[PDB]
Amino acid sequence: NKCDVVVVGGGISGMAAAKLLHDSGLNVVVLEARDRVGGRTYTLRNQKVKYVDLGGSYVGPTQNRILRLAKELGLETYKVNEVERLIHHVKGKSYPFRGPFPPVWNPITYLDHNNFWRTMDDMGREIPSDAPWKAPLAEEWDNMTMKELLDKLCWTESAKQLATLFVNLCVTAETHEVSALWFLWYVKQCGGTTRIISTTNGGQERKFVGGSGQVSERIMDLLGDRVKLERPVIYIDQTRENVLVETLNHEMYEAKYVISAIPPTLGMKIHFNPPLPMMRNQMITRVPLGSVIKCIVYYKEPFWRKKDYCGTMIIDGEEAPVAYTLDDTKPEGNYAAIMGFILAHKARKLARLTKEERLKKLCELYAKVLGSLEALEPVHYEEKNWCEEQYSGGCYTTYFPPGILTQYGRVLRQPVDRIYFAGTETATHWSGYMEGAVEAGERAAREILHAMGKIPEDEIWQSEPESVDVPAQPITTTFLERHLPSVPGLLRLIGLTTI
Amino acid sequence: NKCDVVVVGGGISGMAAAKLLHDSGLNVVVLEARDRVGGRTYTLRNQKVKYVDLGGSYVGPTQNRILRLAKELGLETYKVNEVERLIHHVKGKSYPFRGPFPPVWNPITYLDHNNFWRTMDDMGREIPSDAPWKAPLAEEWDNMTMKELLDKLCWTESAKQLATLFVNLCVTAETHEVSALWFLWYVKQCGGTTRIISTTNGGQERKFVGGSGQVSERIMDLLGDRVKLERPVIYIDQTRENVLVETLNHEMYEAKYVISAIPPTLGMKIHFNPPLPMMRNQMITRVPLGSVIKCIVYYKEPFWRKKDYCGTMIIDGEEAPVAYTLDDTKPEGNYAAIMGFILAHKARKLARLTKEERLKKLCELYAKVLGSLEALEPVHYEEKNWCEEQYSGGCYTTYFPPGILTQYGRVLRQPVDRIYFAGTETATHWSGYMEGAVEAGERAAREILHAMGKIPEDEIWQSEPESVDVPAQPITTTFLERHLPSVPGLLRLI
Numbered sequence: 004n005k006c007d008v009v010v011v012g013g014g015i016s017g018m019a020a021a022k023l024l025h026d027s028g029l030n031v032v033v034l035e036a037r038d039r040v041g042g043r044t045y046t047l048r049n050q051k052v053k054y055v056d057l058g059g060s061y062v063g064p065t066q067n068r069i070l071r072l073a074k075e076l077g078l079e080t081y082k083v084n085e086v087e088r089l090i091h092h093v094k095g096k097s098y099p100f101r102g103p104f105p106p107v108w109n110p111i112t113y114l115d116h117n118n119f120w121r122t123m124d125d126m127g128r129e130i131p132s133d134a135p136w137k138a139p140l141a142e143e144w145d146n147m148t149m150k151e152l153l154d155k156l157c158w159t160e161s162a163k164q165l166a167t168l169f170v171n172l173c174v175t176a177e178t179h180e181v182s183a184l185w186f187l188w189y190v191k192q193c194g195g196t197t198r199i200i201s202t203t204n205g206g207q208e209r210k211f212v213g214g215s216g217q218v219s220e221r222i223m224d225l226l227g228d229r230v231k232l233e234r235p236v237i238y239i240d241q242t243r244e245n246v247l248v249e250t251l252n253h254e255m256y257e258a259k260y261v262i263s264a265i266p267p268t269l270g271m272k273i274h275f276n277p278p279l280p281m282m283r284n285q286m287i288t289r290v291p292l293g294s295v296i297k298c299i300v301y302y303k304e305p306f307w308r309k310k311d312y313c314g315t316m317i318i319d320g321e322e323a324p325v326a327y328t329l330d331d332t333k334p335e336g337n338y339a340a341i342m343g344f345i346l347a348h349k350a351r352k353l354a355r356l357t358k359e360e361r362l363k364k365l366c367e368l369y370a371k372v373l374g375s376l377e378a379l380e381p382v383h384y385e386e387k388n389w390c391e392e393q394y395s396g397g398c399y400t401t402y403f404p405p406g407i408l409t410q411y412g413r414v415l416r417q418p419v420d421r422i423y424f425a426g427t428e429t430a431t432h433w434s435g436y437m438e439g440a441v442e443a444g445e446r447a448a449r450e451i452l453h454a455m456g457k458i459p460e461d462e463i464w465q466s467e468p469e470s471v472d473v474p475a476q477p478i479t480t481t482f483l484e485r486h487l488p489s490v491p492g493l494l495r496l497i498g499l500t501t502i
Numbered sequence: 503n504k505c506d507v508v509v510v511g512g513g514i515s516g517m518a519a520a521k522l523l524h525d526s527g528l529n530v531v532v533l534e535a536r537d538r539v540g541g542r543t544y545t546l547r548n549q550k551v552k553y554v555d556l557g558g559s560y561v562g563p564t565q566n567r568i569l570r571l572a573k574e575l576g577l578e579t580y581k582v583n584e585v586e587r588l589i590h591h592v593k594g595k596s597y598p599f600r601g602p603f604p605p606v607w608n609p610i611t612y613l614d615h616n617n618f619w620r621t622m623d624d625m626g627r628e629i630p631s632d633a634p635w636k637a638p639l640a641e642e643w644d645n646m647t648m649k650e651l652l653d654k655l656c657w658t659e660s661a662k663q664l665a666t667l668f669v670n671l672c673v674t675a676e677t678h679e680v681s682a683l684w685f686l687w688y689v690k691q692c693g694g695t696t697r698i699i700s701t702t703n704g705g706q707e708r709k710f711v712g713g714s715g716q717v718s719e720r721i722m723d724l725l726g727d728r729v730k731l732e733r734p735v736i737y738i739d740q741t742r743e744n745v746l747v748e749t750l751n752h753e754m755y756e757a758k759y760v761i762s763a764i765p766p767t768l769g770m771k772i773h774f775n776p777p778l779p780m781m782r783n784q785m786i787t788r789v790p791l792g793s794v795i796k797c798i799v800y801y802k803e804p805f806w807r808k809k810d811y812c813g814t815m816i817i818d819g820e821e822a823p824v825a826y827t828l829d830d831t832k833p834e835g836n837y838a839a840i841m842g843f844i845l846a847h848k849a850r851k852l853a854r855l856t857k858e859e860r861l862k863k864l865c866e867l868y869a870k871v872l873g874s875l876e877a878l879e880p881v882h883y884e885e886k887n888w889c890e891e892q893y894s895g896g897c898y899t900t901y902f903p904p905g906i907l908t909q910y911g912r913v914l915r916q917p918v919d920r921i922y923f924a925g926t927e928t929a930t931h932w933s934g935y936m937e938g939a940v941e942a943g944e945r946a947a948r949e950i951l952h953a954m955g956k957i958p959e960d961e962i963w964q965s966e967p968e969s970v971d972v973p974a975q976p977i978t979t980t981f982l983e984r985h986l987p988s989v990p991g992l993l994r995l996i
């Protein structure tokens with residue numbers, strides 16, 4: 004029944020909020036809809052895989068909050084395999100390469116590719132992380148889809164196709180589904196294009212030994228009986244002195260404050276008294292999550308390594324069920340595996356098939372790309388379709404369709420009386436990730452601490468010291484990369500020299 | 503507790519479904535979240551206004567289902583005033599005109615305007631009403647916003663601005679918010695551009711005497727104690743032999759079947775066991791409703807009529823809080839009033855103001871456009887901001903952002919085990935309107951009747967005889983309208 008703060012949702016954000024508040028000496032309850040904690044992270048354990056992350060998994064440099072929280076809980080990271088060559092598969096052909104990005108040899112295509120990435124970052128610099136709607140051209144960029152932006156920016160099909168794959172992979176949505184402003188914000192608040200797509204020195208550098216699900220599990224252990232599983236919140240009443248929170252299984256909870264640590268649209272599952280203010284009421288119907296099936300194919304050995312392939316494949320084209328893979332072999336070199344995401348429309352399309360049919364398509368693709376018959380002999384397969392999750396709504400995170408961020412973005416983390424808003428979607432650095440969940444959870448917790456008069460206002464937003472275990476190399480550009488012209492820039496140079 | 507069918511939602515669609523099923527001899531319960539029926543229709547009554555529709559109000563020719571249902575309930579329509587001249591206000595200036603559409607005098611602008619409307623209808627003819635995702639170019643049109651389409655089609659700013667107003671008014675959303683495919687379907691399934699925006703011979707021809715809220719109210723009377731007010735559904739359990747439906751106030755209902763007669767996204771407010779199939783699970787997070795405040799300013803007399811103005815104003819520009827008005831005077835000529843919609847981003851922007859501040863902005867605008875100081879002396883004001891409604895989500899209806907209709911559209915009315923889907927959003931003719939609510943409610947009811955073996959499959963979808971009270975004149979085009987070239991067409995000819 005009675006406590007200081009009810010936290011709705013036991014994912015990383017809710018658990019981090021509850022832990023902070025508990026550590027501060029407050030009585031907290033976590034109400035979790037599912038029979039488990041973790042939310043969009045889920046570590047499956049069986050004999051065949053030992054352990055596997057079926058949701059959120061990767062961490063990297065600049066993600067200092069999740070790294071610190073996990074370290075405190077007794078967890079370790081290991082490096083995702085990127086020792087050998089990456090593969091770029093284009094027009095039914097594989098091109099091995101070293102370094103983070105597939106080389107471009109055609110000089111026009113090179114200028115186009117260079118300009119695209121550069122422009123994405125240039126545009127991002129105009130977008131405040133904590134207030135994207137305050138960008139000078141916010142409205143213009145928000146009233147455009149990423150598809151429209153790509154059509155304007157890319158003078159080659161090659162750049163457009165790779166840019167499209169980049170969008171699909173980053174936000175599990177089609178270029179035509181998402182606001183250009185929102186997507187540009189999303190990339191910028193992750194530290195830019197290089198940081199977001201890189202394995203080495205980027206978001207995909209590392210995984211947790213034993214799985215990411217341990218983060219939420221170990222906090223639950225610390226909180227004891229304070230975490231209530233199978234308690235979906237259905238009703239929040241703020242008419243009285245204490246907030247009343249009701250669950251589906253008929254239980255009633257009373258608190259001074261509430262943290263909502265669920266995906267914004269999942270707020271729809273709760274009936275509010277009094278009704279939510281107009282802007283939030285409408286906002287929560289406007290913010291869908293993306294579509295993804297995470298698939299892991301297991302092999303007897305990491306055979307790709309013997310061919311000097313690290314396991315990273317970037318695969319162009321509609322036919323490919325998966326567009327980006329990573330080696331998912333354990334740090335010990337066993338339980339050899341390839342991880343791939345079936346993204347956006349392909350998640351929708353391929354969900355109609357059986358598990359076995361999906362496995363077959365993946366193996367035949369990998370056999371083609373790696374040029375290896377061994378890819379046709381999987382020993383095991385695991386997958387998770389996040390689109391079917393009632394209490395997630397999708398994965399990895401919430402996307403904003405055109406026009407929504409400028410009109411409703413201000414509302415995202417605006418408190419509603421005694422309800423404060425956590426969840427990775429309300430973060431300002433690595434929003435969408437486990438890192439963002441920690442930031443948002445701890446910030447929401449601190450908002451309540453300030454409301455109670457326990458901390459000053461300037462302590463609500465707290466900086467994080469850099470991890471000593473996972474140091475961040477700065478993102479650099481060469482002179483040529485900075486100053487080489489775009490395609491229209493080169494054409495203008497030709498038109499001017501013709502005088 | 504126990505019945506044949508639980509209907510979730512007591513708006514027109516749910517009420518029509520419940521009435522049909524009740525008339526067939528089944529035991530029906532209606533579970534309604536609010537302390538009233540009607541949903542997106544609401545008729546306010548007080549001495550100052552007598553009665554006023556604050557939500558859905560207008561009906562017109564081809565809307566035969568709502569007309570028949572209302573007639574059976576003892577209701578009558580009257581004609582919205584369009585006797586005198588309409589006004590097109592452009593660049594701070596009023597241009598009175600007769601007929602449905604504002605004249606265009608510049609020949610290039612004329613060609614551009616003509617081509618736009620014609621192209622909208624041409625495109626719509628390729629879109630099946632019952633399956634828009636089956637249009638030959640469905641993906642292409644769905645992956646584009648209406649803003650993108652307008653940018654391609656309109657060679658003049660004049661046409662683009664008017665086209666924008668048209669979109670805003672029809673679907674309470676910005677051109678950049680909505681799929682081109684969805685919007686083109688929306689217009690086509692209302693009978694085309696002429697039918698959708700016309701007062702005379704169109705969707706705004708008539709209102710119900712006494713208000714549209716009477717439709718749901720009178721059905722509730724017919725159903726007696728079967729309608730349960732203040733019963734928001736929170737949980738539907740389909741694991742057992744009978745469906746279990748739980749409400750917020752702790753009551754449990756058991757039925758053989760369920761009709762969901764709420765806006766698709768409001769399905770999110772219900773916890774499902776077993777979980778919804780993947781496609782619907784995601785669909786209901788992808789389908790927002792538009793943004794609108796309906797505002798009615800009352801005056802001592804319908805003074806605009808004396809100046810040979812009917813009360814219809816089409817008002818261009820960002821500054822104007824309202825872009826289209828209609829005379830809202832009662833058929834008796836009293837309770838003189840002007841109705842306007844504050845739409846899309848302007849609803850969001852102007853909601854921050856007080857009621858009094860909004861009234862002032864409306865009156866000053868009307869005084870400008872009508873050229874009358876009398877517009878500055880309102881006797882009364884009523885408004886309703888539908889964006890604040892927990893159990894509506896907005897108004898008039900659900901819009902589809904780019905990419906959603908082709909990917910998730912098939913799911914809209916696909917049954918989930920024993921749950922069937924009503925609501926105006928699932929209609930194929932005047933979806934979005936009271937008319938569509940009747941169609942969907944009665945069709946959903948008939949799906950259950952067929953599932954029970956009570957009617958054959960070909961009786962699920964039923965045609966409606968034309969109303970004798972509100973006959974439909976066919977939409978015609980002139981020879982020049984059909985064959986005059988577009989702007990690029992004329993340039994190609996040069």
Ligand SMILES: *[C]C1=C([C])[C]=C2C(=[C]1)N([C][C]([O])[C]([O])[C]([O])[C]OP([O])(=O)OP([O])(=O)O[C][C]1O[C](N3[C]=NC4=C3N=[C]N=C4[N])[C]([O])[C]1[O])C1=NC(=O)[N]C(=O)C1=N2C#C[C][N][C]1[C][C]C2=C1[C]=[C][C]=[C]2
Pocket residue numbers: 011012013014015016017034035036037039040041042043044057058059060061062172173199200201207234235236237264265266269272273295296297327329389394395397398399400425426427428435436437438440
């Ligand atoms: C799903 C997913 C996947 C598949 C993958 C991934 C992901 C995901 N991610 C993301 C994460 O996970 C997130 O962010 C997090 O987790 C979030 O958290 P939060 O905020 O906390 O939330 P959640 O989890 O959801 O929780 C919530 C909770 O609540 C609950 N509920 C609901 N409702 C309710 C409740 N309760 C009570 N009541 C009511 N009503 C639920 O149940 C839950 O529990 C990510 N992340 C990271 O970090 N990392 C990673 O890994 C991940 N992933 C992804 C990835 C991707 N990446 C990409 C980009 C670029 C690139 C890539 C790859 C490769 C290359 C490149």
Ligand SMILES: *[C]C1=C([C])[C]=C2C(=[C]1)N([C][C]([O])[C]([O])[C]([O])[C]OP([O])(=O)OP([O])(=O)O[C][C]1O[C](N3[C]=NC4=C3N=[C]N=C4[N])[C]([O])[C]1[O])C1=NC(=O)[N]C(=O)C1=N2C#C[C][N][C]1[C][C]C2=C1[C]=[C][C]=[C]2
Pocket residue numbers: 510511512513514515516533534535536538539540541542543556557558559560561671672698699700706733734735736763764765768771772794795796826828888893894896897898899924925926927934935936937939
């Ligand atoms: C709001 C609005 C406004 C402002 C206006 C208007 C409208 C609206 N409209 C629309 C209508 O109203 C609709 O469609 C209907 O109503 C629908 O119905 P339904 O389907 O049935 O649905 P609702 O109503 O919503 O109902 C539902 C119910 O449910 C319930 N719930 C929820 N949730 C829940 C429940 N329950 C239990 N549980 C749970 N969970 C609720 O509460 C409800 O009750 C329209 N319509 C028509 O027809 N007409 C008209 O008038 C209208 N309006 C509009 C108009 C416009 N127009 C335009 C276009 C073009 C033009 C114009 C104007 C001028 C010129 C031109």
